[PDB]
Automatic annotation (TrEMBL), chain B:
GO terms for biological process: monocarboxylic acid metabolic process. It catalyses: a (3R)-hydroxyacyl-[ACP] + NADP(+) = a 3-oxoacyl-[ACP] + NADPH + H(+). It is an enzyme of class 1 (oxidoreductase). It holds the Pfam family adh_short. This is 3-oxoacyl-[acyl-carrier-protein] reductase. Signal peptide: none annotated. Gene3D superfamilies: NAD(P)-binding Rossmann-like Domain (3.40.50.720). Keywords: Nucleotide-binding.
Automatic annotation (TrEMBL), chain D:
PROSITE patterns: ADH_SHORT. Belongs to the short-chain dehydrogenases/reductases (SDR) family. It holds the Pfam family adh_short. NADH binds at residues 20, 40, 66-67, 93, 158, 162, 191, 193. It catalyses: a (3R)-hydroxyacyl-[ACP] + NADP(+) = a 3-oxoacyl-[ACP] + NADPH + H(+). NADPH binds at residues 17-18, 20, 40-41, 66-67, 93, 158, 162, 191, 193. This is 3-oxoacyl-[acyl-carrier-protein] reductase. InterPro entries: 3-OHbutyrate_DH, NAD(P)-bd_dom_sf, Sc_DH/Rdtase_CS, SDR, SDR_fam. Its EC number is 1.1.1.100. GO terms for biological process: monocarboxylic acid metabolic process. SUPFAM superfamilies: NAD(P)-binding Rossmann-fold domains.
Length: 258, 261, 262, 264
């Protein structure tokens, strides 16, 4: 009765923030969904129940996406529990703000690893089944920072730019098939991290801390929501997007337009 | 349905992409005003095809190059259905020619219909959208608004220009409930595109349309398949929906990979 | 002796601002240069003298670039006086700031006509000679506003975006020849026209304080917090006209202090 | 002789013993810069390459360093500082390529391409920026590719790395925008190099039965409208332009030298 009914989706890093919002919107559109976090937590059962309110099959699998063997374990688990992975959402929020000169090498490596190389490993693992089955959606959660630069975000802008380049190549290698690969580029979203960071900067520096943060970059002077990012994923996963290939859906309140 | 009650105007919607957009908006619940350069015997049939989806459908003939007729189209919509809430600027034309011999009149007409008419229609609709606090302006650009192709100088210029205009309107409305965005299709099987293929078929392939279609598509479109008017319409419905309240000043490219390579 | 020695260049709208800076730098690089303004002015001979300081041949021709007949007359004048047009710089600064709802129709049309359609006409008229000779440069002066939008500049952003699209097509149609076509995209440049734009802002919002208005004007858009200069735009034109750019085709050289990078 | 546009400036070009890197080193030296060349390891040919670049009358040196090893990148910068002076022009060039569909792309090759084509540029830039800021002048010139702006089949790692290098370029430029330091990228298309000759050799042997002229036009015509190669000298000319005073306000952008590839 719904546009993604019966489709099996995996959303990496979906226990909070944008990834959870995407999982919620895919389930709301009918998809069965595998949630993923780095480690098991007491809250995980509650998060499953939240997504399960949309009446589809929901599962949870703990896996560190920097470890190729655990990425493989996540795909195999999905195949055992639900069937083939049909919709792969490569989502990874890790950020670190620092000028280039003092940017820690281990943080640089981790941002590249999780935001770019983990998407390669998961895509590599999922493509053979998608080709056999004649259908697939690979949806890479990039950023405005994949299209433009911002100060003190060198690793993140590099990784997100790279994820957009990767998206184009996967789409070209699958262009004659029922598999598409595209990227979503959000602007500022009010994530759990951001709500803590603004509340902390307001108590030290409220609606005025929020306005200063948004006004520099985001002409709408409002946040993008996790539901809006999820709605872009649902659109890319739908039949109307059968010929949307290798492109970006930018949800940013005007950031890249100026 | 996601657009139920909303009043939409689609310019150049008697065939091809414009008709496909109008069809999809009506399916999503919008009332729709169709438009063509001139009244046609088949206009009444086209209205009924779009009316099959149970919304209010009207037709108004108007030459989009004439600012007075653009104004007449908007006032006709306000009288028959109500304030314009979704404006789709689509009417366009094509002319294939090397730059040196490109006819001056054809250059001017392509700029006027593909770019300046969108400006005029947008100018006329924004005051009401601002007063009501909601609007969608959806400009039908092209892959040719992001990249160039040989022998399409005027079209690429006009479509690039329409994308630039889209950004400015979006920025001037960014703090409102009005969004402005562009859809960029690749090759769509339309009567016009079919003519382009016909021309290639006789010049290069002995009139064989199957061989010419594949050669035509594979030059530019990695999917080796056409984009459909239904798909362009589905992108328009997405941009008009609430999930797109924060999509502003951007392009939705529906092109089988053309701009990815 | 210099990298463009002996090349004949035509720079439209070159009696002030960016066009004059381009003419100056092309002459410095050895090119003979034809200057152009909309109409004759008392200052024309002094502008000729400025460009002629670099030891090349210089001419001046008044022509309204909106009128295709006068564009043709400019090209024929150059052919008579100096020789075949080898470097064509399509340059036009016209601007009008207004929200879209009240943007005057005649100003919209003027901006499209001068910033886009005039380039098409001049390119059409110059391409046959360049093709016959197997060499050419068409350099279109676009803007950052041809790559991104800015509030209250709908017509200019549309025209400059269009000029970049036109650039790509001309480049593709000439890609197997010695003719190249590219665009330069300046940010905010220190010119009389831009100073008039800043003065309007200073009077409207900063109590006449040109320093404060300039700071805010640049800070809004240009991360360098400093102007691009007309000499720098001219240096980009010299680069595109040089042999090292024989395979630079259909692209943008953006000179903007970081504007489009963010 | 008379002073030249880059006289007195000290440049380091990574991966400059052949190909694009060598062409850039040559053109910088011709423009008056002192130049430190770099290769992965000591080879019998290093003397000959130094002397070629030194023919233009500037100070030229050679240092062997694996750019994947941050300690060796640091040794390269310190070697330059000791032998010639502060590094003023950094050209991040050392690259590698590997053509494979995504499904079978080897993990070690993916990591190597990311490490050399992206992370090495970050390390070298980090090491050079403090001195540039103290002196109030610098040029960081990153050698990207058309593949940093568009995708191509079977080049997933390379396109990802070169896209990432362009994103990095923007951030460095923005962090330095109010200084005399600029950072920009050059995006070549197909360049006549032994490496790209190998790519045509692979296509020639696999589809054209060893023929090379037929493959060459087919190889170029797919992607490069000029139907001709870009030259290492032209890439070098773009680097000289970015290093020159006329580019003081060119920041965070790309100079695409590609025969029209990205224009269509």
């Amino acid at each position: 009765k719904r546009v993604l009914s019966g489709r099996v989706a995996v959303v990496t890093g979906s226990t909070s923030g944008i990834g959870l919002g995407i999982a919620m919107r895919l389930a709301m559109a009918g998809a069965d969904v595998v949630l993923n976090g780095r480690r098991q937590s007491p809250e995980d059962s509650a998060i499953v129940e939240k997504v399960a309110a949309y009446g589809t099959r929901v599962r949870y699998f703990a896996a560190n996406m920097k470890d190729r063997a655990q990425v493989e374990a996540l795909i195999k688990f999905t195949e055992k529990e639900l069937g083939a992975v049909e919709i792969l959402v490569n989502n990874a929020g890790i950020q670190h703000v620092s000028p280039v000169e003092t940017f820690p090498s281990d943080k640089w490596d981790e941002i590249i690893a999780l935001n770019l190389t983990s998407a390669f490993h998961a895509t590599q693992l999922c493509l053979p089944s998608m080709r056999q089955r004649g259908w697939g959606r690979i949806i890479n959660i990039a950023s405005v920072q994949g299209l433009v630069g911002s100060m003190n975000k060198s690793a993140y802008c590099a990784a997100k730019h790279g994820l957009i380049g990767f998206t184009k190549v996967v789409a070209l290698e699958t262009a004659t098939t029922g598999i598409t690969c595209n990227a979503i580029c959000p602007g500022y979203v009010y994530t759990p991290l951001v709500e803590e960071q603004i509340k902390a900067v307001a108590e030290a520096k409220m609606e005025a801390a929020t306005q200063a943060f948004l006004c520099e970059k985001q002409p709408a002077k409002a946040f993008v929501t996790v539901e809006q990012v999820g709605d872009a994923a649902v659109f890319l996963a739908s039949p109307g997007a059968d010929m949307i290939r290798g492109t970006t859906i930018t949800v940013d309140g005007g950031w890249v337009a100026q």
